[PDB]
Symmetry: C3
Subunit: 423 residues, 3 copies
Amino acid sequence: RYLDYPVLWKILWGLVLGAVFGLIAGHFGYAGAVKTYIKPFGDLFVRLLKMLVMPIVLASLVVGAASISPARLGRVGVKIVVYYLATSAMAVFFGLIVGRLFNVGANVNLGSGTGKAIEAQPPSLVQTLLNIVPTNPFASLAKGEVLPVIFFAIILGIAITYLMNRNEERVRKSAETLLRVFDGLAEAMYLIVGGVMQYAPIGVFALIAYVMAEQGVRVVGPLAKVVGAVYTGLFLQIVITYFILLKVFGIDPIKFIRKAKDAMITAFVTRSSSGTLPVTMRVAEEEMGVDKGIFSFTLPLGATINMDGTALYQGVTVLFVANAIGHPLTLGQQLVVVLTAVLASIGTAGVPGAGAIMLAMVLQSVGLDLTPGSPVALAYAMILGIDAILDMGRTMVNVTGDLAGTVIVAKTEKELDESKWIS
Amino acid sequence: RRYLDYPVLWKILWGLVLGAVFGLIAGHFGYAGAVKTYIKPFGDLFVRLLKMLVMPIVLASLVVGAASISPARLGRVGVKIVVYYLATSAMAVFFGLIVGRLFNVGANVNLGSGTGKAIEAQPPSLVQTLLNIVPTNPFASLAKGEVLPVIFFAIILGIAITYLMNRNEERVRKSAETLLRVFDGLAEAMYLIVGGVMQYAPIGVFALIAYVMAEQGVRVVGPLAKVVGAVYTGLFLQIVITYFILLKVFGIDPIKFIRKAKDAMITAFVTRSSSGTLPVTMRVAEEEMGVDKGIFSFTLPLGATINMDGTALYQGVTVLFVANAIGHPLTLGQQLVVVLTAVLASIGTAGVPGAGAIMLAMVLQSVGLDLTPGSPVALAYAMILGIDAILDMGRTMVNVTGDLAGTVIVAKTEKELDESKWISH
Amino acid sequence: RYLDYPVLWKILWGLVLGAVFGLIAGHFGYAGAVKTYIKPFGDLFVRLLKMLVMPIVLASLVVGAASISPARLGRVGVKIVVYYLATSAMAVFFGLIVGRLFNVGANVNLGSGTGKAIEAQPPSLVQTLLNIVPTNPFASLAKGEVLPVIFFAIILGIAITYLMNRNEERVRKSAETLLRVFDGLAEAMYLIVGGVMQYAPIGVFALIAYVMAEQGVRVVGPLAKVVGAVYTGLFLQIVITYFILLKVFGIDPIKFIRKAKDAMITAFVTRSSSGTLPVTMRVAEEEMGVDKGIFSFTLPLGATINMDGTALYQGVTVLFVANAIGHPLTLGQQLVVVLTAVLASIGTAGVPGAGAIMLAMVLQSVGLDLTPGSPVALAYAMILGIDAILDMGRTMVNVTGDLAGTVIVAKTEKELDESKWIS
Ligand SMILES: N[C@H](C(=O)O)[C@H](OCc1ccccc1[N+](=O)[O-])C(=O)O
Ligand SMILES: N[C@H](C(=O)O)[C@H](OCc1ccccc1[N+](=O)[O-])C(=O)O
Ligand SMILES: N[C@H](C(=O)O)[C@H](OCc1ccccc1[N+](=O)[O-])C(=O)O
């Protein structure tokens, strides 16, 4: 008797009601009950999404790479990579701007020196690039490594397309049967995503309630100033960067938002970019009208290697730590911050738990060495106090940038269905 | 070579009885090492051949069955089979307590204990176990052999395929039908391989029962022998009283059910593995009981996972044994708490690895028998574990039998039972 | 632009140029640079090959077992097993012969007694044989265990063949759909192998360059005698054993060599038999002309349990250590060496980390006990100093013996396409 409501209003009601409920319940100390009784529902939602993340990626990408030309796929890849890099750089730049504007960490008033530390910690870039190529596709599937799955699925789709054009008949029949199996699997995955979207309001409610109950009291003082700065920066990235990029390519951005809102809310409430990937892919297919050969490749790669929100988060937090210990970053230092942030988003591709690694590398690039007990470690733990509050918004902005790049590359290659954008 | 020329049913029965007598004779004379070195490998090969098929057959059969059935009908089937499982488990602990008090298990152990109720062993939170039913990676759940997430994913996939095959578009319907045909072929090949392995099954049953009797045959004396007798009488009671009455009230002739299930029964008994017998149990369900895939392809793996009436009866006997051993006999209310906590542990230990010791520890803790090292209750528990395999054979047999009985009952209720298989002449 | 050249001439140029380049660069001490800048390309090539091993083996073997009779498959298995054992015995024989000819270890002049014994237990044959039978096919696929995959694929193919001959019609359609899926997967895998063969020159160059740069300086004194002995023994095994076996069965050996050249070079540069397995399978089908039901089963089993090169290597190294410590092996001890070497190649079938277990087993079989600090341990580390130079040839000869056995069994079963052998 609950499914009778519109799903969009249901997800919005879930979000707002969970926010207010978690805030009031954490302000009254019953947050444990929220962790005991309310959070399991959001946990169930996130588990249902993670269940679908891998098969949908495999099947959708093999089908899309099959139903497209290799030169087209390479052109799409170069376009989407240039887009991702430009958006990440603009995100770090906006983050530094809003950090210097809010003067984040100015009132922390901590004392620190130049006590250095050596680190050979950055993961080898060559080894990660090699690790893009799996040594066992079944293992990469079981271990949930998305980039090896992308590589294997693209190669398999290209092979299937080359196989269906043979003078022999057995070869064409077998290749077409395989492609039909993969297509049925992908369609079933999208249907199951649509089905799970009915439980999404309860999951959003529970997740936002737990997050607000736990870390709602901690957003005071300089941490509150940082929260305001990061949210202003994310809003700035969205509006300025994404809307300008969309209108330049002649697409209505407000409709883009009305379509992406589902993936936006899901990414925001789950704080997992790759975990929302099924919802983002469904939004690409059955609302925006993007061709499979575009998004089935750009969206997983975007969720993996394109994080504008985290880029802006690092850009603001480095200035916060700098002003906290009393060593504000110079202009050249901020330029180095932007450069090392993009280089860390690229060099930590698929490396597990890279957010702390990326932030440590960004701090190292300017000299802020994360030695235990040091004041910089104190400021970093201060930030990790509100890390989840920031993670919601940064994940939302990451998935939004991914979707914007996908639709832009589709509009360029004329693979975008305009019927869904004219009402 | 010319060994398949005999009926495979008589062959597995002969294997069982000859291996039982052979293991008893070889273990009573101390030659158990030779049996462990030369004879057991064949039973190991049999159990490995059976384990090989468990995952693909379950996945494919359940995807096909959930596809070829209605979602509301499947949910009704789930509710029916779950209430059946719980009622049978409760009756099983009740029978176990009855036969334990009748045999007076543990009376002559004569151990000393006080009221020193020490607390240990934080139980894993139930909510996380319930959530773990939903997989986070189907490929990973397949590789790890986790049965319940595979069940969930397969049900969802079958429902999706059925709803996909009824679309106004035509290409999508063809693709969905191709996928369903792939799963159907995989399942049929798996059942054919189960039938093939059933020809080697006599050697496996012989070797397994021989090894078990050789190892733990000398240890079934005194109070441990009384426990063996009590638990086997209780398992026989559960079979006869509970299962036959449940079948006859629902209008099924129980002797036919037993004569058909005997293959899976013998396999479960000799292998002591429920999920390892699951392929044989499903083939018996299809080609003997006449159950539709949409019923058993869902109820039989879930039953092998979360329905163990034999283990409930085993706990009902062993808790009374330990209580009488340490000299603190269980009251009637304590025995009711035993039954309730045993059913609740069969529910709360769904798919958690190594959950049998967890369940027994929980039932012992629920009455105060706390397993502190060196304590008398731990001593009595190790005394029981001395004959663990001897008891495991029968309890596994009864688990698989209860699973099959529930599946057949729920199938007959949903009209998915083929009555042609039940008419003589 | 660069693919416009014949790929065979390209891989040969890569091999020889990389050999000379690594030799020149290691004689000047800059070999570290080769490990930093050159080796990643060979690593990429080897990972691209590792990616394909599981899908190609699974699909090819299920298809071949389907498209063949079970009795024929068993006869082929018996033939190929007898071939493998005979070739391994001949390999240890040639190793002992060339070792006695080169007098390996004579000038080491080490001192040893009859002291303390070590016992690397041989894996019990029963447990390994049982582990051939998987308990979970998905797990064996993810873990890359080849023999359980072989067993499961053979059983599945036989089941599909028995299913296609049933009175029911839906069952035949489903079985044919499944077999078509597997066939398409196998054909796509072979197409991808052909594609990777275009990058193969760079990988071959990089691998041989790294191996020569690292272990090029190490070929001095008795180690040079060991290198010469093992290479002469492998050359003899090829010419004497394999050519005679091929000509006896009415096959032209020079044609076999000219066809196997691709898998030979790949195995040589990658030193991995199972990693070269896709190239060997493609060469077997589309050059040698063997039916799927033959090679799709014999070639993986050969890569797993047939290693003539390693057998000859052990035959040489045992004599080397014996002459090093000053206790030359008697004739009966050398016979025990060959017997235990064949029995260890059989008893370490699919057991992880073999060859070290096998060599320890042979040394225990003659009494040379590998206790740490002992002179035998010193000589063994002396040998392991140049392990890769020998490993190249050992892997090449292993895959060559596998291919020769496959072609011989095909000629016997008349499953060999003679058109591919007509000039
Ligand atoms: N989890 C957030 C997100 O949804 O992007 C965000 O990125 C984490 C991150 C970074 C690099 C590679 C992969 C991931 N990852 O997906 O955990 C963060 O924690 O700040
Ligand atoms: N071993 C018997 C069987 O399952 O066949 C039976 O159950 C043990 C049990 C319990 C829970 C999860 C898994 C298992 N398991 O498979 O060992 C028993 O010993 O009473
Ligand atoms: N690597 C060589 C080869 O390609 O055969 C050769 O065998 C190693 C070996 C042995 C047993 C199982 C697997 C492997 N393996 O593939 O590393 C060697 O190192 O001497």
